[PDB]
Amino acid sequence: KETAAAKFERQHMDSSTSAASSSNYCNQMMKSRNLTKDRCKPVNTFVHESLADVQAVCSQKNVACKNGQTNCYQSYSTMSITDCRETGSSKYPNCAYKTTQANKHIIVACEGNPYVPVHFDASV
Ligand SMILES: [Ru+3]
């Protein structure tokens, strides 16, 4: 079974690329990472930093989660990320996305032991 930690890595980690490679990055990634299996996931973010760096965020700046929980953390340093947003013309199963590269602080929710990232809350 896929753990919460593994799911976070599948849905949000992409250390291979340094930034939003091409304009079709999201179209390929959202599909390959199985985010368009049962439907077109509305929005999703991929982080282009090492796994260690992202996991380290769980010990960085503690901030409130969007859902009101207190287990969210903001990276002290900005990180290379790619935001994927479904286009208005997108129609399942042919999910279409707009790829946007950026450098911002990420906010992730952490849980468990080891205390690791399990949800991507936001970027600021
Ligand atoms: Ru800043």
From Swiss-Prot:
Compartments (UniProt record): Secreted
Enzyme class: lyase
Effect of residue 12 to A: Loss of activity
Assigned keywords, A-Z: Disulfide bond, Endonuclease, Glycation, Glycoprotein, Hydrolase, Lyase, Nuclease, Secreted, Signal
EC number: 4.6.1.18
Residues glycosylated per entry: 1, 7, 34, 37, 41
Tissue: Pancreas.
Keyword Glycoprotein: yes
GO biological process terms held by the UniProt record: defense response to Gram-positive bacterium
GO MF, one annotated term: RNA nuclease activity
Residue numbers annotated as active site: 12, 119
Task of the protein: Endonuclease that catalyzes the cleavage of RNA on the 3' side of pyrimidine nucleotides. Acts on single-stranded and double-stranded RNA.
Subunit organization: Interacts with and forms tight 1:1 complexes with RNH1. Dimerization of two such complexes may occur. Interaction with RNH1 inhibits this protein. Monomer.
Name the record gives this protein: Ribonuclease pancreatic
Full-length numbering of the shown residues: 27 to 150 of 150
